[PDB]
Design a protein around this nucleic acid. Structure first.
Lengths: 99, 82, 104, 91, 99, 80, 107, 95
DNA sequence: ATCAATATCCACCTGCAGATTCTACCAAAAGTGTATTTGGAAACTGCTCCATCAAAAGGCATGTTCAGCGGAATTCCGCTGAACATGCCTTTTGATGGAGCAGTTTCCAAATACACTTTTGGTAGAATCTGCAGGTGGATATTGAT
DNA sequence: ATCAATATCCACCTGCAGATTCTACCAAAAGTGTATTTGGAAACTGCTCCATCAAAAGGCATGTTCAGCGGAATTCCGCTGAACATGCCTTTTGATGGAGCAGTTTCCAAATACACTTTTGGTAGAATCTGCAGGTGGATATTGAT
């Protein structure tokens, strides 16, 4: 009896949603710690203008998102609709990051 | 003491980024792969960034540090003073 | 009279002229140079605000925000190419979903 | 220092009743500087692949062509030449 | 009398061969012609140093040969061994040249 | 004949081979030529633009090199 | 009996030339005395890294004159050099021997 | 007839210091030359940027160094700095 | 496993095209010595903005259940690319006028340069304004079950 | 198709943070104006090196045939998406101490800028010299048929 959307209805719903907006999607603080972690196990006693963390984060999400598009394209090329590790990997291969 | 913060990049967050990117279905194996790929992207931007900082003999990474770093990598950002 | 009014322009001829020198791009900068480059510069901001401005209008908005700049750029073949490796913070992406992915 | 008041004039000319949020002006500001360095850059090189010590309006113009897409360049050249000629025909 | 190599053996032989050498593989004059023709839409009555054609040729083959390595990869990702138009299309898309 | 068709199937075949390709769909050649056409149109346009900037009538090796460098396809062996 | 800066830095590369080009390069208003030298040292060094690798290449070919193929194999077979020259094309170098396993005859 | 400078004579010197009995085809030399000019350009370019960021008028070894760090892969960068520094130290300790 | 057709590999051979050693004329470097100038380190410090801790609440991440469907494996046509031997058309090679790419020389418009005079576009900052973010409830989809 | 469950849409409403609004100060700009220097257009020129016409060469076009590949169909099942519960930690709003960025005056090692002088790297021209590519032979490995 209880309502239940078919697998994928919500997914498409989320693409529509997310593609319609521009907030960042990675938790703010969590990401900052990663920044401070990577930076520091790289050079100690460093500091950050909050804008520098914010630039790192806008850059990253924009890379990651742009990456999934390519990955998504790769899966479809393979006649699938589910992205997989090798898709991401084929995209970076072709992109030069590897090869 | 900072450790395992790569796990702060949570499934849900990595799933939203895939949505913005137009992806309807995601394999379980994508998340670990994505953090792998993000960690490298960060290290690359930050090594340069911090190299700009040191250069300048400062202790604080400025956003321009990052903006220059991103421009070295061919990933030019707009909106932070360049 | 400023060199911009002399050149029929809203962008700063003299500032651009100064900038060319500190950029140390050549031992010398002819006067024609900053005039021309300030034109092209102003011409291009005109084009992108002309197009951003409509995106704001198409969105029941009055104040342009980054999303409108992004819409403007990605929706125009030339700007999108000129700006193909550029990230406009807070811009989002163009709505776009592959076909195979829709209901059946 | 910034191009903001200038962006703003231009802005009021295309869209008289429209405003711009700082975050956008900021991006506008980045944009202008980017284009500037690119043009200046192609100019720099052009000038000296030719054992020229000067960047004139002519280098900027080839640069605009080497750098911008088709219609945008057809149009920048236009505006650029227009301006020079007007600047010259005065004083 | 009857010999006949099976499909793929000579292809293979040819790959081994060509990855060994370095000569150009497009015939000069037709190429020279193509270049001259394309260029003739940009400016008229042009002359070309022999080096400039040779450089252009050398640059196109390395381009196409590489585009062939990403195509082949794209075909294998689709579990094919036959490259196709779409395979080239997908590589050029992920590369940043596409529509 | 037409010049782009001057780039023949056996040559495209040889290229492919060098790129380690074993089986080739017949529809490739045409698709390939368009890619080579667009490639050369992009480079030449910039090389020839360099040419004119210098008031000459001969595209120079260097003019191609400067062009490949802007296209981001740096070439070694011809000065540039 | 004047001595050249290159001999003072103890190098084969033209410390004076590099300096000359740096000024003419419109890179800065001024050029420290040590940059010409340093930069020259760096150039030379990278030079040595490729000719050494390229030289081996020729040995491995039972050859004694280095040609482009020798420089191309020297490069794309070294993670670091190959990365450094990853958007560069060496005329006449061909490509490394390589065949996707899936394309091999089933044994 | 206007000269045409190139690094070929140095390339060759350096070559012999490494593989004394090996020779280099002409086309090879031309590549090595392009290699040097490219690297030159790249390092100088970064160096220039570096000065402008820091509102500095002079490109010094400092700049060449950070530049090298930004331009080269790990180990390469490492030696490059080593060599780099050897050269300046030696040049200084000398009349 | 067995030949049988072929491809591939290797040691040797040798002519020659391109690499090398020679002699040398020379303007452009590159080094030297003097004289002048100044970029940007060092020392004192005003001041911003970064790390931090503090407390509260609610938006989210997490962890589970569960069954629909998408990915993977298998089978199986039929069509389409590969092998091939066939016939000769174009490409390649090579000898040659002439059109420019270059080397030089001249001088005038145009670019430095330093000196004043003046106008502007950053900004610190209190004051006033205004698009819209975020809340709401009611009208129209859109989905999924039957 | 008719139909309940829900998400989506969209215009009306309003406190609010972020945009607009002078008022004032002023250092740094940008402009005006001689005075000095010079770059590069411009014309004349000579000598490469390029386009071209001929002839020797050596691929490519072509039609046949069939093997093997791609993709359509079908199926098993395992994993991913949806919904739900619980409650942790991010987000938000402040406030505080102080580190380190950034402003300024100061002063000298290092840089520039002629000018005199020594020399070296590039060109050209000749003559001599050599690594190797292709050409042979003959051994043997690979492929494909039976």
């Amino acid at each position: 009896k209880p309502h239940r959307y078919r697998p994928g209805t919500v997914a498409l719903r989320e693409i529509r949603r997310y593609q319609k907006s521009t907030e960042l999607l990675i938790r703010k603080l969590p990401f900052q710690r990663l920044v401070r972690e990577i930076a520091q196990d790289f050079k100690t006693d460093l500091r950050f203008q909050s804008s520098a963390v914010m630039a790192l984060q806008e850059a990253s999400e924009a890379y990651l998102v742009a990456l999934f598009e390519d990955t998504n394209l790769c899966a479809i090329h393979a006649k699938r609709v589910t992205i997989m590790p090798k898709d991401i990997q084929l995209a970076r291969r072709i992109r030069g990051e590897r090869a | 003491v900072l450790r395992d913060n790569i796990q702060g990049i949570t499934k849900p967050a990595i799933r939203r980024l895939a949505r913005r990117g137009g992806v309807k279905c995601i394999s379980g194996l994508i998340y670990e792969e994505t953090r792998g790929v993000l960690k490298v992207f960060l290290e690359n931007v930050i090594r340069d960034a911090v190299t700009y900082t040191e250069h300048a003999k400062r202790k604080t990474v400025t956003a321009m540090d990052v903006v220059y770093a991103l421009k070295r990598q061919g990933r030019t950002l707009y909106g932070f003073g360049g | 009279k400023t060199r911009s009014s002399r050149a029929g322009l809203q962008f700063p001829v003299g500032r651009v002229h100064r900038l060319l020198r500190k950029g140390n791009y050549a031992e010398r900068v002819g006067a024609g140079a900053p005039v021309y480059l300030a034109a092209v510069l102003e011409y291009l901001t005109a084009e992108i605000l002309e197009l951003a401005g409509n995106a704001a209008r198409d969105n029941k908005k009055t104040r342009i925000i980054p999303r409108h700049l992004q819409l403007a750029v990605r929706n125009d073949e030339e700007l999108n190419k000129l700006l193909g490796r550029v990230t406009i913070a807070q811009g989002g992406v163009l709505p776009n979903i592959q076909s195979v992915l829709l209901p059946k | 220092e910034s191009y903001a008041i200038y962006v703003y004039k231009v802005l009021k000319q295309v869209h008289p009743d429209t405003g711009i949020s700082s975050k956008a002006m900021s991006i506008m500001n980045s944009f202008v500087n980017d284009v500037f360095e690119r043009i200046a850059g192609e100019a720099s090189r052009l000038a000296h692949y030719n054992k020229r010590s000067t960047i004139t309006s002519r280098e900027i113009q080839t640069a605009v062509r080497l750098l911008l897409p088709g219609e945008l360049a057809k149009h920048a050249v236009s505006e650029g030449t227009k301006a020079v000629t007007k600047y010259t025909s005065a004083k």
